[PDB]
Design a protein around this ligand. Structure first.
Ligand SMILES: CCCCCCCCCCCCCCCCCC(=O)OC[C@H](COP(=O)([O-])OCC[N+](C)(C)C)OC(=O)CCCCCCCCCCCCCCCCC
Ligand SMILES: NC(=O)C1=CN([C@@H]2O[C@H](COP(=O)(O)OP(=O)(O)OC[C@H]3O[C@@H](n4cnc5c(N)ncnc54)[C@H](OP(=O)(O)O)[C@@H]3O)[C@@H](O)[C@H]2O)C=CC1
Ligand SMILES: CCCCCCCCCCC[C@H](O)CC(=O)SCCNC(=O)CCNC(=O)[C@H](O)C(C)(C)COP(=O)(O)O
Ligand code: SF4
Ligand code: SF4
Ligand code: SF4
Ligand SMILES: [Zn+2]
Lengths: 51, 43, 114, 173, 83, 112, 118, 339, 198, 385, 145
């Protein structure tokens, strides 16, 4: 930390997000039988189907 | 005897998603400032 | 008895392959002594190939002979290419190790278990 | 549940693309990130003056402890030798005149040792412990081989901290 | 010198090692330290010996201080107990 | 119709129902030479017949993909001709014949 | 088609063993006896063949035992006497098999010792 | 003593505790090698910096080699080195008598004190080393001095094996490298045009094994073995041969030894290890003594090894980009002149 | 107690018969272990045929080769027990096909069936000495270039017979017969008392 | 066809790899990787050691992924004994299983860049790594090579306070992954050296046994953690990051995405880890607590026998595979009734991947080979074993 | 046996006595199995060792302290499965897993009793009997061990 409020703003502007919130300084016939039922195809993730 | 366990009520939430910000000057605006600079320089 | 064959039905055919490998090594010894800058004499080297070839001269089992050349050929490849750097080749000559006498009196004088 | 990492011509779209391609924008973005850290406090520690934190279970360097009275704890059961994965510990024993059972020779070969910490685990009297010190680099290979006298001496030097460390972690074990 | 008196000798071919470098030996040898320990008097016929501190001691054993003739000695601490 | 299959190398096969019907009917044909009571012939004929019965029955590829599983239809095509290749291979191999030889005695006894 | 060989499988030439340790090493095929200390007999079941013991000189620097014989710690376990003999023949090591000796049946009965007569 | 147990290789014991004072140098590198290979306890006194002594550490098992700080002008240092050794080998020698050590010191003065103490200690045998053909009236102060010493060493440690070796050639040899190193001088100045200079060269290893064997052999006591070689040579063939393997031209140029002793003086003047010296020059142009009767390498068990056999390894570094790939048997071996 | 799902034990058993009927010729034994795993055992000649059927059969697609290994039971006449473990991404299942090979009776190579085996087969030759016919390039992979002997064989000494050190005289690394400074202490660990099989 | 040994000591080549190459021009005609420069005998040594004293070998097999490897042997030994770990231990193993995945991906993505030439991502994330190591140390005692996950559960409960810190870190690590993306994910130059380099088809990836991100990157959906759940990876919810147009860039994106998904799994584990014991209660398999062995005779006997002799696993053989960060890590552990194993072939995701180097780097430049060794996360310990 | 103990009560202790210079009787170890009292009466005719008392303080030691002096004496060590009485010379020199066991022949006496020589790191640590039905059936003399 010890950003001084101006190095921090250059840091925030250059990065484009707030590092202050997430700092680098930690502080205090028969059936053919398959081996098992065919796997169901996976579902699209609902929270983010694509990145 | 105490066992390290999640705090009561559970921990808070973490971010698991990219928060990369799509911030930029629009392209036309970008080119115009540049072309304007060359026009002034040429004059 | 009653054993399946690998590459040679009879010692005869197998011996054919040994001849080929010998030739291979014989033709190769000189090159190695030059591409590895080994400090040995080609004549000496070919002698080594002979010795190593002869060391297993007793075998009369078709199958055993066939594997022996497979293995022999593999060694050649490595040596043909530079996969086996000099340290590897010279090891064949057992240059650093001190030779042990086989005379009984000699062993008696030196080792508890001969 | 699966996710597609990289599944995916208006003038504006095309122009902006050209703006990026010819103005190298995505490259300038990267420079900003590094300039940002240049302003962050670096995380390095003065190594001799400040030391990277190690908690009580750190295995570090072997030591043989002694009872407060002054009787060395080891009673030569020799299962520390049995469970040593690397064959490092060599123990030979004989009844001391007292009649008690003690190790005539206890040699941990530290170069053979892979600091697993099972010996710490196995000892019934907990005579052999993984001491905190990690700085025992030695000029000669022989110094690394340790006999009973070096380990007992190592035990006496670090006993105060070893006792504190075992005090902190014994409930867990 | 040492506990079991290791004495690489004046004629050994190993005493060469300490030349210009000291040997590792121990003061406060343990052999004499428990001998320096007072005999723990007790009332009961048999007594325990956690080694002192329970989990931080030795597997607990019960010693029979039944004969004043002999002060029981826990095989782990070498502590003599005087009935 | 689709743009592409998930699998990188596989490419969309247009006329997929026709391509499958061609491959499925071929296999059935090759199997016709296998010995009559040969286990492979009875088992695979049953699997292949069910597959194309479904292929002929379903005119929608997306539902076709659900009915015989197979994920994308293109894969089912690859599996069918792979099987067609093995059917040709096994006729040469003649696996239906009796066991080559019994294992040596105690060859399969693990406790040792 | 198979070919015929009456040559005892000897594969000493393929195993890759130094000449000294194939011609000077005698291995003994024996069923391990039981440490009289314990009465369990689960370690007297499988045959083992063990190579002859060799030099174990003291090490000058630390006093640890030191051995120059590679085949010392190797004891292979074979289920039957016939199979173990086969291993020695094809590997070319000399063998001297020792017959298993199993405890003879012994007649015991609690009533018998209560006999004052005898 | 130390009963010899083991199979014969590293990590085995032979029972020879041996101080070897000049281990740091050319031959020492070899003496410690065999002694270490055999499993002998080797105490190497050193006054060179620890960085230089490192090459020695790699040779021998954990605890076989012990290094002690020692100063020649201090008798006490020699005293403690031989305290626990039973074999003392002396290889102390130099070619340029230095500011604070003159030939007497390096050859006669020091090597005496050493054996002297060794006796006080009770070492079984002492093996002093003096040059072959070190006549007490030879031309080089060195050879004269070396002889002077052998006389003295016999007084202090009577019957301390003495070995007088002939020119010694091995990687890092002077005899073989030095000539190859005359390349800078376009032509090669050789008295009598390199003739009238018969010399017999001995591989460094040959000399060593002998020395080591001398320690473990009873007959060696009170002997003056002279390791010589497998073939003699007029200096002419030697010089050319060398240049031959080095594949560098040869221009043997006659130059009076008179004037040349002066060239040696010039290099001798140089502060840093003169490349050549008045004495070295004389020694060079000093012919080797006859076989006489002195026993030899094969007597001590090591059959001499011909120069041509290993020359290729010693002279290889001096070749060029391509010449570096030529081998000795396609090359022509030079003729042998016994004279 | 592990959470066994009998649902599996049965389905895999049923496949085991399926395969046994489909290839009566090479399958010698088939069993679904209590650990819910199938281990068809095939005559060495059935290496090519049994694998291919599993790689390319609609009702049993076993596309990837998890591993090829060779336990060595010295007692067993056929010393090596080549074991091939295969996976089916389609049916989410696995099967192990294990054959037996003696030292000088080579097995066929499956590099054709699965190219994954190109390396593992070289690994089995280097460590155990089994030979694989029709292998594209069989040559030692893990051992040193000049190594003599097959290391994972139960009859090979752990420490081995050769070790390397640098020798000044010859200025080059040099093998010497192994001389160890503390031999491997061979603790005997088997207890003379067995455990009554459940 | 110029021949050249990439060289054992190559700043780029991870560890020591002699990649003999025949290069037509700068293009690489043939790639014959050599292996065994790190063979050490791990498979033979284990036969001479008891089950618990062979656990430390597994940490060394692929030590970037120190613990995840230990879980595979654990699971395998537990199956043979038909014992399963207690509920808290399972969550722990998934907690440290994932932390370990991050550690591997930070290694793989940042070391990939160092060979490419980007050096600042490595320093950025090695600081985060460092912080993670400290978790290992405060749980096991060792920064890496812990030996914490043993065959019957973990060794000792988490210190009183670790969970809270594995939170603070997790709460922030995301931003640290975010920062790297900025520089590389879209660098106008990362893409070029990575995109369309080493494309592997889907059918070919299954055929050469790739089994890892390498398969997932080609679009094949297979995560052994979802298909065949091990431990309690079933009770968590995560999304496998499947890829299309599989190439060095796509797979990378996948590894950055599993770093993201592992933070989702870690969060849960912290939110839902049960109160309980961390080792099986069968003194038969798990060593007795030290208070118990020092006060109860049956516990000393069980402590003495377990440490000196061993588990005595029932005779059998099993192949158990987990989803180690590199790919499918499996142990085929044949076992006689003895306390020491009989065979333990370690399947290394990496023996298969290297083999693919030839079929991936064809008609490629010297720099391409450097990029592809990176996209396979080759740790020579697992390949050489 | 069982995985854990339920004996929350206290333990007993007996008083170590002297049975001689060869057998160390740390008899607080004794499981009152009466093998010794048998061997000492049936295999060897000493008839000295006996049970003394009843209840949980039955101690199987000589009532008066008379040493167990007889040949065949050391066998008690091998026959007591508990380590109550064990060998005094081989008190604490080793531990059995380490001991490499080589099967050889007794040369001290002409019965040629079979014996197993237990060697650790190259010096013999103990010689204990190995069974030969005809010659020494599980027993060896006090001299040859
Ligand atoms: C060197 C000085 C310029 C670089 C400074 C980098 C650190 C400061 C932070 C910059 C930042 O955050 O911008 C990110 C942004 C990221 O841009 P972007 O990737 O969002 O794209 C913006 C453009 N669109 C959206 C249309 C695609 O960089 C930009 O501001 C756009 C690129 C501008 C390039 C201008 C080049 C002019 C060169 C003049 C040289 C003069 C020399 C004197
Ligand atoms: N090859 C040859 O030229 C021949 C040599 N010899 C004899 O063999 C012996 C060994 O030869 P080589 O190894 O080539 O000789 P080097 O010039 O290599 O020196 C040999 C050793 O003597 C030591 N030494 C030299 N001067 C002093 C000094 N003033 N005080 C203490 N130590 C000293 C050196 O140690 P440091 O350098 O650290 O002082 C070195 O270790 C010599 O003594 C020589 O007389 C005999 C015939 C031929
Ligand atoms: C210097 C260069 C070093 C190169 C060394 C080389 O690579 C290593 C080497 O030669 S590896 C030798 C092994 N070579 C064999 O093992 C062939 C055995 N061939 C047979 O045994 C025949 O079948 C027969 C029975 C006819 C022999 O009978 P004969 O007496 O030779 O005739
Ligand atoms: S375990 Fe503890 S007590 Fe038993 S020997 Fe090793 S150190 Fe001494
Ligand atoms: S730490 Fe592991 S290796 Fe080192 S001694 Fe204790 S047990 Fe043996
Ligand atoms: S044998 Fe051992 S245990 Fe049985 S009674 Fe005699 S002493 Fe007590
Ligand atoms: Zn006590």
């Amino acid at each position: 930390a010890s950003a001084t409020r101006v190095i921090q703003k250059l840091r925030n502007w250059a990065s484009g997000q707030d590092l202050q919130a997430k700092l680098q300084l930690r502080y205090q016939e028969k059936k053919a039988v398959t081996p098992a039922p065919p796997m169901k195809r996976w579902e699209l993730s609902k929270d983010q189907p694509y990145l | 005897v105490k066992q390290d366990m999640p705090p009561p009520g559970g921990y808070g939430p973490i971010d698991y998603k990219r928060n990369l910000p799509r911030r930029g000057l629009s392209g036309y605006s970008m080119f115009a400032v540049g072309i304007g600079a060359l026009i002034f320089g040429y004059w | 008895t009653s054993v399946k064959p690998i590459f040679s039905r009879d010692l005869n055919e197998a011996k054919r392959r040994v001849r080929e490998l010998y030739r291979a090594w014989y033709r190769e010894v000189p090159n190695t002594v030059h591409l590895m800058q080994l400090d040995i004499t080609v004549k000496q080297g070919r002698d080594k190939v002979r010795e190593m070839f002869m060391k297993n001269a007793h075998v009369t089992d078709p199958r055993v002979v066939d594997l022996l050349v497979i293995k022999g050929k593999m060694e050649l490849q490595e040596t043909i290419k530079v996969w086996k750097q000099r340290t590897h080749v010279m090891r064949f000559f057992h240059e650093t190790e001190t030779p042990r006498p086989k005379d009984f009196l000699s062993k008696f004088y030196m080792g508890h278990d001969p | 549940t699966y996710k597609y990492v990289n599944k995916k011509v208006d003038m504006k779209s095309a122009t902006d693309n050209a703006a990026r391609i010819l103005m190298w924008t995505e490259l300038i973005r990267g420079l900003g990130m590094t300039l940002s850290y240049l302003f962050r406090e670096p995380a390095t520690i003065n190594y001799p003056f400040e030391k990277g934190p190690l908690s009580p279970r750190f295995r570090g360097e072997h030591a043989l402890r002694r009872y407060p009275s002054g009787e060395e704890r080891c009673i030569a059961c020799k299962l520390c030798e049995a469970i040593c994965p690397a064959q490092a510990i060599t123990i030979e024993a004989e009844p001391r005149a007292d009649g008690s059972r003690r190790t005539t020779r206890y040699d941990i070969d530290m170069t053979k040792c892979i600091y697993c910490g099972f010996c710490q685990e196995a000892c019934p009297v907990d005579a052999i412990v993984e001491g905190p010190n990690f700085e025992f680099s030695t000029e000669t290979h022989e110094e690394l081989l340790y006999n009973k006298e070096k380990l007992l001496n190592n035990g006496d030097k670090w006993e105060a901290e070893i006792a504190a460390n075992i005090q902190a972690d014994y409930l867990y074990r | 010198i040492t506990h079991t008196g290791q004495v690489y000798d004046e004629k050994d071919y190993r005493r060469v090692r300490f030349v210009d470098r000291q040997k590792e030996v121990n003061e406060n040898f343990a052999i004499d330290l428990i001998a320096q320990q007072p005999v723990n008097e007790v009332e009961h016929r048999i007594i325990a010996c956690d080694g002192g501190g329970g989990a931080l001691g030795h597997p607990k054993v019960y010693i029979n201080l039944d004969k004043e003739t002999k002060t029981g000695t826990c095989g782990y601490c070498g502590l003599q107990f005087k009935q | 119709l689709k743009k592409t299959t998930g699998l990188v190398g596989l490419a969309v096969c247009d006329t997929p129902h026709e391509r499958l019907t061609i491959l499925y009917t071929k296999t059935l044909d090759i199997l016709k030479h296998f010995p009559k009571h040969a286990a492979y012939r009875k088992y695979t004929e049953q699997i292949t017949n069910e597959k194309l019965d479904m292929v002929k029955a379903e005119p929608d590829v997306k539902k076709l993909e659900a009915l015989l599983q197979g994920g994308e239809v293109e894969e089912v095509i690859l599996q069918a001709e792979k099987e067609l290749s093995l059917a040709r291979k096994m006729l040469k191999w003649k696996p239906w014949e009796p066991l080559v030889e019994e294992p040596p005695a105690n060859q399969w006894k693990w406790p040792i | 088609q198979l070919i015929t060989v009456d040559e005892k499988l000897d594969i000493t030439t393929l195993t890759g063993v130094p000449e000294e340790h194939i011609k000077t090493r005698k291995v003994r095929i024996f069923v391990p006896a039981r440490n009289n200390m314990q009465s369990g007999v689960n370690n007297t079941k499988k045959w083992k063949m063990e190579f002859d013991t060799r030099e174990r000189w003291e090490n000058p620097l630390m006093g640890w035992a030191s051995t120059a014989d590679p085949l010392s710690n190797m004891v292979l376990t074979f289920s039957a006497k016939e199979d173990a003999i086969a291993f020695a023949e094809k590997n070319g090591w000399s063998y001297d098999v020792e017959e298993k000796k199993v405890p003879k049946p012994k007649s015991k009965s609690y009533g018998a010792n209560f006999s004052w007569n005898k | 003593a130390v009963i010899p147990h083991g199979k014969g290789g590293r990590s085995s014991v032979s029972g020879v505790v041996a101080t070897v004072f000049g281990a740091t140098g050319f031959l020492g590198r070899y003496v410690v090698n065999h002694l270490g290979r055999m499993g002998s306890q080797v105490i190497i006194p050193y006054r060179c910096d620890v960085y230089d002594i490192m090459h020695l550490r790699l040779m021998g098992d954990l605890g076989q080699l012990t290094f002690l700080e020692w100063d020649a002008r201090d008798k006490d240092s020699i005293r403690k080195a031989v305290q626990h050794s039973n074999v003392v080998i002396n290889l102390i020698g130099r070619e340029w008598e230095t500011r604070n050590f003159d030939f007497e010191d390096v050859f006669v003065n020091i090597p005496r004190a050493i054996a002297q103490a060794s006796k006080e200690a009770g070492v079984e045998r002492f093996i002093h080393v003096s040059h072959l053909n070190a006549s007490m009236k030879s031309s080089s102060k060195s050879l004269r001095s070396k002889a002077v010493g052998e006389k003295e060493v016999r007084s202090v440690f009577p019957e301390a094996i003495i070995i007088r070796p002939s020119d010694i050639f091995g990687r890092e040899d002077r005899f073989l490298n030095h000539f190859a190193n005359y390349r800078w001088f376009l032509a090669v100045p050789l008295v009598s045009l390199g003739f009238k200079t018969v010399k017999q060269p001995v591989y460094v290893a040959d000399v060593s094994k002998g020395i080591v064997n001398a320690t473990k052999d009873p007959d060696a006591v009170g002997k003056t073995f002279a390791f010589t070689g497998p073939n003699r040579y007029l200096l002419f063939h030697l010089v050319k041969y060398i240049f031959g393997m080095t594949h560098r031209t040869f221009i043997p140029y006659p130059l009076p030894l008179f004037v040349y002793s002066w060239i040696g003086k010039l290099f001798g003047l140089s502060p840093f290890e003169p490349w050549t010296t008045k004495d070295k020059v004389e020694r060079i142009h000093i012919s080797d003594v006859m076989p006489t009767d002195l026993p030899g390498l094969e007597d001590l068990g090591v059959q001499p090894t011909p120069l041509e056999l290993k020359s290729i390894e010693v002279l290889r570094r001096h070749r060029t980009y391509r010449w570096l790939s030529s081998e000795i048997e396609e090359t022509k071996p030079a003729k042998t002149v016994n004279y | 107690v592990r959470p066994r799902s009998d649902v599996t034990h049965k389905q895999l058993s049923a496949f085991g018969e399926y395969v046994a009927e489909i290839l009566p010729k090479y399958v010698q034994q088939v069993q679904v272990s209590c650990l819910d795993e199938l281990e068809i055992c095939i005559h060495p000649d059935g290496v090519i045929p049994t694998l291919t059927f599993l790689r390319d059969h609609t009702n049993a697609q076993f596309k990837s080769l998890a591993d090829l290994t060779a336990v060595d039971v010295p007692t067993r006449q056929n010393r090596f027990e080549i074991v091939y473990n295969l996976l089916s991404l389609r049916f989410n299942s696995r099967i192990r096909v294990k054959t037996y090979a003696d030292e000088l009776t080579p097995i066929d190579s499956i590099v054709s069936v699965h190219i994954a085996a190109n390396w593992y087969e070289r690994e089995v030759w280097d460590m155990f000495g089994v030979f694989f016919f029709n292998h594209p390039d069989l040559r030692r992979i893990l051992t040193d270039y000049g190594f003599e002997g097959h290391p994972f064989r139960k009859d090979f000494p752990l420490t081995g017979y050769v070790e390397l050190r640098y020798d000044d005289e010859v200025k080059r690394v040099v093998a010497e017969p192994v001389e160890l400074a503390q031999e491997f202490r061979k603790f005997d660990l088997n207890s003379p008392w067995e455990a009554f099989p459940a | 066809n110029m021949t050249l040994n990439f060289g054992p000591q190559h700043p780029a080549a991870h560890g020591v790899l002699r990649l003999v190459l025949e290069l037509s021009g700068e293009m690489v005609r043939k790639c014959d990787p050599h292996i065994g420069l790190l063979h050490r005998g791990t498979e033979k040594l284990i036969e001479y050691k008891t089950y618990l004293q062979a656990l430390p070998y597994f940490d060394r097999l692929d030590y970037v992924s120190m613990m995840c490897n230990e879980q595979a042997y654990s699971i395998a030994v537990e199956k043979l004994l038909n014992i399963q770990p207690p509920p808290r231990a399972q969550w722990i193993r998934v907690l440290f299983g994932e932390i370990t995945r991050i550690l591997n991906h930070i290694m793989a993505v940042t070391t990939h860049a160092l060979d490419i030439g980007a050096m600042t991502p490595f320093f950025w994330m090695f600081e985060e790594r460092e912080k993670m190591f400290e978790f290992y140390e405060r749980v096991s005692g060792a920064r890496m090579h812990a030996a914490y996950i043993r065959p019957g559960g973990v060794h000792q409960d988490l210190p009183l306070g670790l969970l809270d810190d594995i939170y603070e870190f997790s709460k922030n690590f995301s931003l640290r992954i975010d920062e790297v993306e900025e520089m590389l994910t879209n660098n106008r130059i990362w893409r070029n050296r990575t995109v369309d380099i080493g494309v592997v088809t889907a059918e070919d990836a299954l055929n050469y046994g790739f089994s890892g991100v390498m398969l997932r990157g080609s679009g094949i959906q297979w995560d052994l953690r979802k298909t065949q759940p091990y431990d309690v990876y079933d009770q968590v919810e995560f999304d496998v990051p499947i890829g299309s147009r599989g190439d060095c860039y796509d797979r990378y994106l996948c590894r950055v995405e599993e770093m993201r998904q592992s933070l989702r799994i870690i969060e849960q584990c912290l939110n839902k880890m049960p109160p309980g014991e961390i080792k099986v209660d069968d003194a038969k398999v798990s060593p007795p607590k030290r208070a118990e062995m020092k006060t109860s005779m049956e516990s000393l006997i069980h402590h003495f026998k377990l440490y000196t002799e061993g588990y005595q696993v029932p005779p059998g053989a099993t192949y158990t595979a987990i989803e180690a960060p590199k790919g499918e890590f499996g142990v085929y552990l044949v076992s006689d009734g003895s306390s020491r194993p009989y065979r333990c072939k370690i399947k290394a995701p990496g023996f298969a991947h290297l083999a693919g180097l030839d079929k991936m780097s064809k008609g490629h430049m010297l720099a391409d080979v450097v990029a592809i060794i990176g996209t396979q996360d080759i740790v020579f310990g697992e390949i050489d074993r | 046996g069982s995985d854990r103990s339920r004996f929350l009560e206290g333990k007993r202790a007996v008083e170590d006595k002297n049975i001689g210079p060869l057998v160390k009787t740390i008899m607080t170890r004794c499981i009152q199995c009466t093998r010794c009292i048998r061997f000492a009466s049936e295999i060897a005719g000493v008839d000295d060792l006996g049970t003394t008392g009843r209840g949980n303080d039955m101690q199987v030691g000589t009532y008066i302290e008379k040493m167990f002096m007889s040949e065949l004496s050391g066998n008690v060590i091998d026959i007591c499965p508990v380590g109550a009485l064990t060998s005094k010379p081989y008190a604490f020199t080793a531990r059995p897993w380490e001991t490499r066991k080589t099967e050889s022949i007794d040369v001290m006496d002409a019965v040629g009793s079979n014996i197993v020589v237990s060697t650790r790191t190259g010096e013999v640590m103990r010689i204990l009997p190995r069974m030969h039905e005809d010659i020494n059936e599980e027993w060896i003399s006090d001299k040859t061990r």
